[PDB]
Amino acid sequence: AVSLDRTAAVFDGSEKSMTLDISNDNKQLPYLAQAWIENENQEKIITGPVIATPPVQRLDPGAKSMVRLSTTPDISKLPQDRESLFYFNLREIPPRQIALQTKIKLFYRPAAIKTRPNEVWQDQLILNKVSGGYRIENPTPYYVTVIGLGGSEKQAEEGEFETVMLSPRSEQTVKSANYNTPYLSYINDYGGRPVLSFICNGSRCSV
Amino acid sequence: AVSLDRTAAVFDGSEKSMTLDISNDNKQLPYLAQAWIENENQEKIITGPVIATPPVQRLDPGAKSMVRLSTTPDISKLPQDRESLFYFNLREIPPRSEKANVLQIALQTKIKLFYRPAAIKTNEVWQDQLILNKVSGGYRIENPTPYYVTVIGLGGSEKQAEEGEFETVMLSPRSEQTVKSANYNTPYLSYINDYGGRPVLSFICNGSRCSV
């Protein structure tokens, strides 16, 4: 079984490339590993502006390798004030029993919106009480992945399948209960799952 | 972890529906099972001619369920003299968890789903019609029948035919593929049959044309 080094990747727009480490954790049989890039619509794109190499590769048992993610000149065609979403894809082909694949989000982040250290831009989310839920607003230049909404801090962490991903400078309507003091849980850049407290004022709520 | 009851499925053209069994082998956490159909080029298709019900479903810990495959009346547009290739897809979606050993990303898979029209319905071994014609730097495998034949190994002996790791070569009905390989005095070929088995065949070559 081929393992990836992470569950989500931020592509620093400052760099022209970056690598991901993979490894065949089977200490006996060898595995193939196909890699490819998709756009936000999940459609395979082969001419860039982000490409994966090598496309396919053999991993001897217990071996460790990598995949390279480089950009092409038309990388400047993508917006430079917001992130763009791609999906890094990976399929492991077992030797002679079915192939398994995974896709992780690949967040291309232009150098202009490179975040400052210890920066928490998720403070800018705005909650709007709607009919049976919230019209959540993300004014930031980044995709924010919400994983739980609660009435208490620990209640924002017990949801099972409450995952909602917002686009930069957008709004979504999420079906939800109406809490007095909503607490939002989210995934950060490294995989942390911090919680935010909101104080509502009428229909509109903020941190 | 959602599991399928088979590595490949054959859709019988005479039937209207057919079910695949899926189980949640995790006896502690609930999972969503996303199912969908793709055509021969691996593009999702929602308007038929084959559909999967339901698209999404919650499988409680250790639960067992099923996905239904069925045809829409536009199934009649497909050729009745050969098989048609579809892919059944399954994506398992994990709940949020803090357990270190639980993967927090969705995994997926697709098995081949061969539509077999009522006319070409079959213990019959149609892979016997396979012909091997010697050519430069290998052979030209010809598939005279109306079915798909998956070739997973080609060698000098029965064991060298099962020594193949990743050399799969799938043959469209009534097609032919040239495979680069060594010239063998007695070529053995291994293929996947409908049930998932892996038989091996023995070829007798009379000049440049070889047959079972």
The dihedrals phi and psi of B48, each to the nearest 5 degrees, come to 95, -175
B94-124 burial, b for 16+ CB within 10 Å, e for fewer? bbbeeeeeeebebbbbbbbbbbbbeebeeee
Do residues A162 and A155 lie in contact, with contact meaning Cβ atoms separated by under 8 Å? no
Question: Which amino acid does the sequence have at B160?
Answer: Q
Contact yes or no for A32 and B95 at CB 8 A: no
Which residue of A30, A99, A148 is in closest CB contact with B109?
A99
Token digits of residue B34: 């996303």
B→A interface, C-beta within 8 Å: 4, 7, 30, 32, 58, 93, 95-96, 104-111, 152-153, 162, 164-166, 198
CA distance B185 to B194: 29
Beta strands in chain A (DSSP E): 2-4, 8-12, 17-24, 31-39, 50-53, 58-59, 64-71, 84-93, 100-109, 126-130, 133-138, 144-150, 164-166, 170-175, 183-187, 195-197, 199-201, 204-206
Do residues B186 and B154 lie in contact, with contact meaning Cβ atoms separated by under 8 Å? no
Which residue of B58, B109, B164 is in closest CB contact with A98?
B109
Nearest to A125 by CA among A75, A182, A59: A182
Can you tell me which residue has the tokens 């695949």?
Answer: B20
Contacts of A160 in chain B (CB under 8 A): 30, 95-96
- Shortest CA distance from B153: residue in chain A: A96
Contact yes or no for A98 and B7 at CB 8 A: yes
CA distance B46 to B171: 26
Token digits of residue A19: 């690598």
Can you tell me which residue has the tokens 């739980």?
Answer: A148
CA distance B9 to B196: 9
Do residues A33 and A91 lie in contact, with contact meaning Cβ atoms separated by under 8 Å? yes
Do residues A60 and A123 lie in contact, with contact meaning Cβ atoms separated by under 8 Å? no
Question: Which amino acid does the sequence have at A132?
Answer: G
Pinpoint the alpha helices (H) of chain B: none
Interface test with B, best of A4, A87, A90, A96 (most B CBs within 10 A): A96
Contact yes or no for B30 and A160 at CB 8 A: yes
**Nearest-10 Cα torsion for B23, B26, B28, B29:** -80
Contact yes or no for B96 and A30 at CB 8 A: no
What would you measure as the largest C-alpha separation in chain A, in angstroms? 63
Burial (CB count within 10 angstroms: exposed 0-12, middle 13-18, buried 19+), residue A110? buried
CA distance B202 to B188: 5
Query: Could you tell me whether strands A126-130 and A133-138 are parallel, antiparallel, or unpaired per DSSP bridges?
Result: antiparallel
Question: Which amino acid does the sequence have at A156?
Answer: A
User: Residue A19 CA to chain centroid, in angstroms?
Assistant: 16
CA distance A166 to A6: 21
CA distance B58 to B2: 11
CA distance B81 to A153: 63
Give B180 to chain A, closest Cα distance, Å. 19
Nearest to A104 by CA among B152, B104, B144: B104
* Domains defined for chain A, CATH in brackets: 1-114 (2.60.40.10), 115-207 (2.60.40.10)
* Bridge partners, residue A41, by sequence: none
The dihedrals phi and psi of B129, each to the nearest 5 degrees, come to -70, -10
Contacts of A30 in chain B (CB under 8 A): 165
**Nearest-10 Cα torsion for B151, B157, B160, B162:** 50
A→B interface, C-beta within 8 Å: 7, 30, 32, 93, 95-104, 147-148, 157, 159-163
Burial (CB count within 10 angstroms: exposed 0-12, middle 13-18, buried 19+), residue B143? buried
Do residues B68 and B53 lie in contact, with contact meaning Cβ atoms separated by under 8 Å? yes
The dihedrals phi and psi of B157, each to the nearest 5 degrees, come to -140, 170
Which residue of B32, B95, B105 is in closest CB contact with A7?
B105
* Bridge partners, residue B50, by sequence: B71
**Which residues, at least 6 apart from A76, have a Cβ–Cβ distance to it below 8 Å?**
none
DSSP string for B23-51: EE--SSS-EEEEEEEE-TTS-B-SSSSEE
- Residue A57, classed as helix, strand or coil, is coil
**Which residues, at least 6 apart from A104, have a Cβ–Cβ distance to it below 8 Å?**
A4, A6, A7, A8, A9, A87, A88, A90, B105
